[PDB]
Design a protein around this ligand. Structure first.
Ligand SMILES: C=C(C/C=C(/C)CCC=C(C)C)CCC(C)(C)/C=C/CC/C(C)=C\CO[C@H](COP(=O)(O)O[C@H]1O[C@H](C(N)=O)[C@@](C)(O)[C@H](OC(N)=O)[C@H]1O[C@@H]1O[C@H](CO[C@@H]2O[C@H](CO)[C@@H](O)[C@H](O)[C@H]2O)[C@@H](O[C@@H]2O[C@H](C)[C@@H](O[C@@H]3O[C@H](C(=O)NC4=C(O)C=CC4=O)[C@H](O)[C@H](O)[C@H]3O)[C@H](O)[C@H]2NC(C)=O)[C@H](O)[C@H]1NC(C)=O)C(=O)O
Ligand SMILES: *C(=O)[C@@H](NC(=O)Cc1cccs1)[C@H]1N=C(C(=O)O)C(=C)CS1
Length: 649
């Protein structure tokens, strides 16, 4: 019965149909790749040699003595030499660039291409791959075409071992062998290994399969497939006793070689992807997600949390203590770092987005910002009464707020500037009540805090406002930018596999409060750090000229710190998940975590550029403006400083 060779031949044509429907189109449901911030280096930019090495190491760059592969760098007395690895940037796709970065003190002078010895207007740094968004299959892959793999890695694989391809692609011996002779005849020998190098099982991440050479190289070493050393190339081929198999591959093909994710930040990323695009993203294959994430700021914030919390737990003899750190861009609102606990590597509860706590004294700048927005009535030299308060509540209660020392000024008065500097409760209520709670509540709305959290009662002025550190970061960013509310974002762009722009971020800053009131509040916040509540930071970092504010709720249940540098707004919270005493203050708790965060990186000094109609004016001991001289110089929102003439008469 020669009929058999006809029904098996028609099965081969109906197998060639199946190897077409798959390979001609969607081969895999490639998970979405999440990338960090794309840093553009530029001549005259304020970055040091040490700051650049740290930035490089954080972006998966390895320090060497002589460069041979991309993603490597060398350190010299006043320069850095690097082979910037190829990256498919959304703006323009680039390749290998051998560049030299020459420094002059705290700033970069030149970025010169070592191939033609020419200067760069700006030089692009590739972003670090943070994580992959969980695939529906559970099979995690990162697609790279044939060419992307080095010739040595290909040869380490050929041999040991088309036959395997079909097994992992369509099967649960004769069936695959028939498919193998259908495959090899239809597609080129090089196309065959392209699919093989992106199919093979190489690892396990919980209950998510880590398959293919490009994702395995990063999942095991933290460096791309192109930049794999022969010993590492052998191990990746060998996995297709652990040290023994690496050496087993080495002997097959010597003695030297044989001797040799962000759960807090991703919550915001996944939440923003859902809000901006919807359910349309998840279906699409091989999506590229570009975030605002800073590897340098994060590693520094994690280190400050992992080291600071147990150091505070041993000093105050605490059984349990927790923290939350949110770093956002001063001007754009871009979220650079997010810490939701003392264990930022191993987490389920994100304190930076879920721990809704009383803000305390962090509510004070809203009151002074509302006051300073009215320059014809409220200035820095404005006298505020500091005497016993008794306010009527419905029905029979009397609210008598006190300053922390339960004391009042001998004169019964303080200047607005000192009241915020020292975080004095009594004059803050007096000022807040004279302006009225609806005026102070309106400032908060403009600062971008949630509307449903604002209850306009006298207690609001002192800190009866429950917010998460991210909502506090939004409020402080608005004051820090110079009075522009830039809605906080984790997403820069969302790009399809075919290079199609699905989502693109654009600036949407809104003028919330006047620039002058925001400056006057910021300059006053520099006084808290230098001479007021945050004085311990100001003594450690006097040249940074930080603008800050401490927070210490009633019964030491919460310690807050709102730190502002030249480039970032950092909100720190230190407290207990059981809402209990921490034996800590704003300065000793949250601020101690911020210093460590400042020491763990290189911060940008805050040089307040005064906006329009700002004049430095002299006041006498009585607080009255004087023409020439005065024992105190205060900046004033005025277009004609001859407020002095009117005052002197
Ligand atoms: O046809 C059969 C096919 O039978 P296999 O057993 O699948 O083929 C293996 O033996 C071949 C041979 N004839 O000698 C081969 C050696 O040529 C195969 O190597 C190849 N094709 O290149 C060898 O296949 C390999 O077999 C591995 C498992 O077999 C193990 O082989 C050992 C010695 O031969 C035995 O001692 C083991 O008992 C036997 O299990 C394949 O790896 C497996 O790949 C699976 C996808 C993994 O499953 C996951 O494991 C995870 C996990 O363990 N955690 C999770 O549980 C997850 O839910 C689960 O899906 C699974 O954990 C993982 N197991 C091992 C030991 O690596 C691995 O994926 C697979 N490799 C390829 C390229 O397809 C044949 O030709 O033999
Ligand atoms: C605001 O936080 C303000 N707190 C209170 O008045 C309630 C108190 C809590 C502990 C003692 S009184 C306080 N501001 C600071 C600060 O950290 O800036 C505190 C030192 C106490 S007054």
């Amino acid at each position: 019965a020669i009929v058999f060779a006809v029904l098996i031949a028609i099965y081969g044509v109906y197998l060639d149909q199946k190897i077409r429907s798959r390979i001609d189109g969607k081969v895999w449901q490639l998970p979405a790749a999440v990338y960090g911030r794309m840093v553009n280096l530029e001549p005259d930019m304020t970055i040091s040699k040490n700051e650049m090495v740290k930035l490089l190491e954080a972006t998966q760059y390895r320090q060497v003595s002589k460069m041979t592969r991309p993603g490597e760098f060398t350190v010299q007395a006043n320069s850095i030499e690097m082979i910037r690895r190829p990256f498919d940037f959304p703006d323009s796709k680039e390749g290998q660039v051998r560049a030299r970065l020459t420094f002059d003190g705290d700033h970069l002078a030149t970025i010169v291409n070592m191939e033609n010895n020419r200067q760069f207007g700006f030089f692009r740094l590739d972003p670090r791959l943070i994580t992959m968004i969980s695939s529906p299959n559970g099979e995690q892959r990162l697609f790279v075409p044939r060419s992307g793999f080095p010739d040595l890695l290909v040869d380490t694989l050929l041999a040991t071992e088309t036959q395997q391809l079909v097994k992992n692609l369509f099967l649960s011996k004769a069936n695959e062998a028939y498919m193998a002779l259908i495959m090899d005849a239809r597609y080129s020998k090089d196309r065959i290994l392209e699919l093989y190098m992106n199919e093979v099982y190489l690892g396990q991440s919980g209950d998510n399969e880590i398959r293919g050479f490009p994702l395995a190289s990063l999942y095991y070493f933290g460096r791309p497939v192109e930049e794999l050393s022969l010993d590492q190339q052998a191990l990746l081929v060998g996995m297709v006793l652990a040290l023994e198999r690496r050496n087993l591959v080495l002997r097959l093909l010597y003695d030297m070689l044989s001797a040799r994710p962000q759960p807090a930040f991703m919550q915001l990323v996944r939440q923003e992807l859902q809000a901006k695009l919807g359910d349309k993203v998840k279906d699409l294959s091989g999506v590229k997600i570009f975030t605002t994430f800073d590897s340098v700021a994060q590693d520094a914030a994690e280190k400050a949390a992992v080291e600071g919390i147990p150091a505070l737990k041993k000093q105050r003899k605490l059984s349990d203590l927790e923290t939350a750190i949110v770093v956002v861009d001063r001007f754009s609102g871009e979220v650079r770092a997010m810490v939701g606990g003392s264990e930022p590597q191993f987490a389920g509860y994100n304190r930076a987005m879920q721990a809704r706590r009383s803000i305390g004294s962090l509510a004070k700048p809203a009151t002074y910002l509302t006051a300073l927005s009215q320059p014809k009535i409220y200035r820095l030299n404005t006298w505020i009464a500091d005497a016993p308060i008794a306010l009527r509540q419905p029905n029979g209660q009397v609210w008598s707020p006190q300053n922390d020392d339960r004391r009042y000024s001998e004169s019964g008065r303080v200047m607005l500037v000192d009241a915020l500097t020292r975080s004095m409760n009594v004059p803050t209520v007096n000022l807040g009540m004279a302006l009225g709670l609806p005026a102070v509540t309106e400032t908060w709305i403009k600062l971008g805090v949630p509307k449903d959290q604002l209850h306009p009662v006298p207690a609001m002025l002192l800190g009866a406002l429950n917010l998460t550190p991210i909502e506090v970061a939004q409020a402080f960013q608005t004051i820090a930018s110079g009075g522009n509310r830039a809605p906080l974002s984790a997403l820069r762009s969302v790009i399809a596999e075919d290079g199609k722009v699905l989502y693109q971020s654009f600036p949407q800053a809104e003028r919330a409060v006047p620039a002058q009131a925001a400056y006057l509040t910021l300059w006053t916040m520099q006084q808290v750090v230098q001479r007021g509540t945050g004085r311990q930071l100001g003594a450690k970092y006097p040249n940074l000229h930080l603008a800050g504010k401490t927070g210490t709720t009633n019964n030491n249940v919460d310690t807050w710190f709102a730190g502002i540098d030249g480039s970032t707004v950092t909100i720190t919270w230190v407290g207990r998940d059981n809402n209990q005493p921490t034996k800590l203050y704003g300065a000793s708790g949250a601020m101690s975590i911020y210093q460590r965060y400042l020491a763990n990186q290189t911060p940008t000094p805050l040089n307040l550029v005064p906006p329009e109609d700002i004049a430095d004016m002299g006041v006498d001991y009585d607080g009255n403006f004087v023409c020439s001289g005065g024992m105190r110089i205060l900046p004033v929102w005025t277009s004609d400083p001859q407020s002095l003439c009117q005052q002197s008469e």
